[PDB]
Amino acid sequence: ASKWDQKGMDIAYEEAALGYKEGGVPIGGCLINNKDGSVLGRGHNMRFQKGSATLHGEISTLENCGRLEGKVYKDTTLYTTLSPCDMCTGAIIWYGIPRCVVGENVNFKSKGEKYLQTRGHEVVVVDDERCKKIMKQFIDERPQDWFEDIG
């Protein structure tokens, strides 16, 4: 699966950078088929774009994949620029996405990371400097938007 990790993080970061330029929270993702590297879906946080409580970058990514047979998710990696919250963690667990690759968990880390490992999922934190820099820039410019969301 790891031979698609560069592709997956590059797409996730592109989604985060699209979101940033749209005036949103720079959190992006994509879902890749581990066998052939095909992109099933990609998305970014739509909190500000759509006034959305639930379209986190990971949720938006899964929504953008469309209706799938459940078996499709079982050989995928979900790429996200930021450590997933408990809701997004639960979506990974529920669909049985076996592997989650995380840009960084410096600006945010939920109990979801550990819970994924407890439920038998592989979690890889790449500690990517591009992801940390864009998230830190949003947090510095828009602290009330950030700390009102994550608390």
Catalytic positions, written as ranges: 58
The answer to whether 117 contacts a copy of itself (rule: CB under 8 A) is no
In b/e form, how buried is each residue of 87-99, taking b as 16+ CB within 10 angstroms?
A: ebbebbbebebbb
The answer to whether 40 contacts a copy of itself (rule: CB under 8 A) is no
Torsion sign across C-alpha atoms 78, 126, 130, 49: positive
Q: Which residue has the tokens 């994550």?
A: 150
Binding track, positions 58-77, relative to a copy of itself; x by CB under 8 A: -x--xx-xxxxxxx-x----
Among 1, 11, 82, 91, binds a copy of itself (CB under 8 A): 91
Phi-psi sector, 147: left (phi>0), alpha (psi -120 to 50), beta: alpha
- Name the residue type at position 111: K
Residue 20 binding target from a copy of itself, Zn ion, none, CB below 5 to 8 Å by type? none
**Which residues are at the interface with a copy of itself (CB under 8 A)?**
47, 51-55, 59, 62-63, 65-71, 73, 85-91, 93-96, 110, 112, 115, 147-148, 150-151
